[PDB]
Subunit: 144 residues, 3 copies
């Protein structure tokens, strides 16, 4: 049947485009998630908008492998990265932007300790996390 | 059935690739149209060939939103853009390259006024149009 | 039926992404093969890994048209390119990395003449081939 070989060509072409983007370092693929940056360092609200404009979301690692991918991008551009999570009303508790409680974490030892005054989360270039105010300039990393 | 979740993965991956290209400013998507440039400034015939070689066509805006997208690219590269239209045998009348009469227009006030000696159309960096000879160096913008 | 117009949109979007990558010189498409480089010059083993990490393979031309595409990339970056082939146990005989005997060739006159001491193959910037040791720094070109 012509349908499946049409699917074959389509799948092949998608893999070619993703292959080119990967080879050139334009993105990193981890499982079903693709991470990318525009190289800009801006505040949390600005990153959120940049990602959504491109049809994605501000990146958030939910597994060690995802964490290491974002860390490698932070390291490449030598700047910390704002992540897609924010502090609950209760200090020390963080949620994803959809409202769910954060599960996987990788806090730098002692963090989070902003006492409710640091509602955002940055990833240091070693991949560990720190709660931080949301107005700093951080590398914009999106997930798709 | 395995067919639709296969379609789901395919759709997701296409959105990832488009998301990366968009985030990095490699293209602009407006409805079903994608605009992109190679950053080169060359004449009308040269642009036509560059676009067709890449499987697209020299850009032409048919809506205000498309017009503003091309204008933003003109503004980014600080150069006017040749558009995909050319003057009819009768001065003042323009057609798309497929032969159809141009519908949406955004002429700079007083334009077109080349009296038949300016068969091409350039978009100024403010998005308005001017009829112009076809031999100038203009930013190559393609639509796909 | 909704399936085929869904396929239409998918095909269109793939062509847009490939069009953007092509227009910007990020890849070259020849038939069903896509060639791309990361611009790096490294040894044979390093190229192999870079290509496989991106989901492709070190490039190998099997037709004159494929050969000319890789040559154009060699010429663009002004460096010779390691190809996806290696010498058999018997000097002068080369195979693709899957083990099959090489068919199409484009040896520089007199080549291969490494007497079994040059197990890799480089493409000179004019597109002709030379057997060479595998430890030189050559442009990494992948096929997808
Ligand atoms: Ca803190
Ligand atoms: Ca004029
Ligand atoms: Ca030799």
């Amino acid at each position: 049947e012509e349908l499946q070989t049409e699917l074959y060509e389509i799948k092949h072409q998608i893999l070619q485009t993703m292959g080119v983007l990967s080879l050139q370092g334009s993105m990193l693929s981890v499982g079903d998630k693709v991470f990318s940056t525009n190289g800009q360092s801006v505040n949390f609200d600005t990153i959120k908008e940049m990602c959504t404009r491109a049809g994605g979301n501000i990146a958030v690692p939910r597994t060690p492998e995802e964490n290491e991918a974002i860390a490698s991008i932070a390291k490449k551009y030598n700047n910390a990265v704002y992540l897609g999570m924010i502090e609950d009303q209760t200090p020390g508790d963080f949620h994803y932007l959809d409202g769910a409680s954060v599960s996987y974490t990788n806090w730098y030892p002692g963090e989070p300790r902003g006492q409710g005054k640091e509602k955002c989360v940055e990833m240091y270039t070693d991949g560990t996390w720190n709660d931080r105010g949301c107005l700093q300039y951080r590398l914009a990393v999106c997930e798709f």
